[PDB]
Design a protein around this ligand. Structure first.
Ligand SMILES: O=c1cnn([C@@H]2O[C@H](COP(=O)(O)O)[C@@H](O)[C@H]2O)c(=O)[nH]1
Ligand SMILES: O=c1cnn([C@@H]2O[C@H](COP(=O)(O)O)[C@@H](O)[C@H]2O)c(=O)[nH]1
Lengths: 218, 219
């Protein structure tokens, strides 16, 4: 995946008008948008096709897929039917649950991103201790796309080590959660940024500013 | 605790609105509590919750396996309760802050959180099983009252019941299609969740009636 400016917008506004307006305001800076349940549950799955129609951007569906294999398969089918290019899946529920998602993605020409270690404090309780193993599991399963934590660059670096330089790694927790864009891009291919852009008085200027700060990395 | 008719919750994971409504209507005399998940919601919209409420006298548990950071969890719970769900299922593996975010919204909005402890599928053995006793204990410490545990592992379901105590509410999927037994599961769970064994049956009503007949002495 080739992400413009190494910057993925996390569009977690919950109103269609605002989400479309803000995305439009930063469209010159990005070609990849992560849409999650805050927007989808508020406005419907049709929002994905609307983003494709208006912006042509890639859409990563951040659905943290975390069920049994049979249910995971159904979730992935519904998500790809709506036009998502990729889906984010949890590894904590185990290999069969991940494989179910990989199968549907292959069938529909899409990508699975595996969440390895989350960026919030609670991730320390259970996720962090399993994260290296979840990454190795991804490698064993042939997962090529991973998500790791901007808030812990030492952990992000370890995850990069496990998956290798050929795998694609994206990283949320930049800005609002405390992560630094440039430091994160030492290890991740792209950063995910939500609030620092979409809650800014001037989202375009916020996006521009982040990009300016990492210009030598582009 | 919610009073689940016949100790039986329908897992309505059909993905077509017409089929989901037909099957649910056919079993409505047996079941007053329906679990609606992402297979149906992502196919038909959050308004499917409204339609179920309108058509049937059923409580709705939104099985959304909520598993994000606190800020995102809060938004998911708000949208879900806004749409009319009585309760939402959340994961514990993302940790206490993530669970607390859901509890806070549920408290504010007058709804309920169910905490997934150990899942019933084979993959649950890899990471979830080893965390599950602590996830349950974390739930107790946080004041969680409602829990989900695995029909497929009676020994684990029994231990999780012990951890959460007899006063907590425990529901259990994995019955039927995944191998779990209704009666054995109800030794520990307040109610069983059944999906495919009912909704893929030639006669879903007869399937539900048969399950209920088999546990009649436990009602
Ligand atoms: O470990 C994490 C942390 N956050 N997110 C998601 O990335 C975005 C971070 O947004 P933010 O820049 O506003 O913090 C939100 O959509 C959040 O659910 C993840 O996928 N994984
Ligand atoms: O540990 C589990 C196992 N299954 N489920 C959910 O319960 C239902 C089980 O359906 P089934 O009777 O068709 O197996 C499905 O909706 C599945 O996502 C859980 O919530 N937790």
């Amino acid at each position: 995946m080739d992400v413009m400016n190494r910057l993925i917008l996390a569009m977690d506004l919950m109103n269609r008008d605002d989400a479309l307006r803000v995305t439009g305001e930063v469209r010159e800076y990005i070609d990849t948008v992560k849409i999650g349940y805050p927007l989808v549950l508020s406005e419907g799955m049709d929002i994905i096709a609307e983003f494709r129609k208006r912006f042509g951007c890639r859409i990563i569906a951040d659905f943290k897929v975390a069920d049994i294999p049979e249910t995971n398969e159904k979730i992935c089918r519904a998500t790809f039917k709506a036009g998502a290019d990729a889906i984010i899946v949890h590894g904590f529920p185990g290999a069969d649950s991940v494989r179910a998602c990989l199968n549907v993605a292959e069938e529909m020409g899409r990508e699975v991103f595996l969440s390895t270690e989350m960026s919030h404090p609670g991730a320390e309780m259970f996720i962090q201790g399993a994260a290296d193993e979840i990454a190795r599991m991804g490698v064993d399963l042939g997962v090529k796309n991973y998500v790791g934590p901007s808030t812990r660059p030492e952990r992000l670096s370890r995850l990069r080590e496990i998956i290798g330089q050929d795998s694609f790694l994206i990283s949320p927790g930049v800005g609002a959660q405390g992560g630094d864009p440039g430091e994160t891009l030492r290890f991740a291919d792209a950063i995910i940024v939500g609030r620092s852009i979409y809650l800014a008085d001037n989202p375009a200027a916020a996006a521009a500013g982040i990009i300016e700060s990492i210009k030598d990395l582009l």
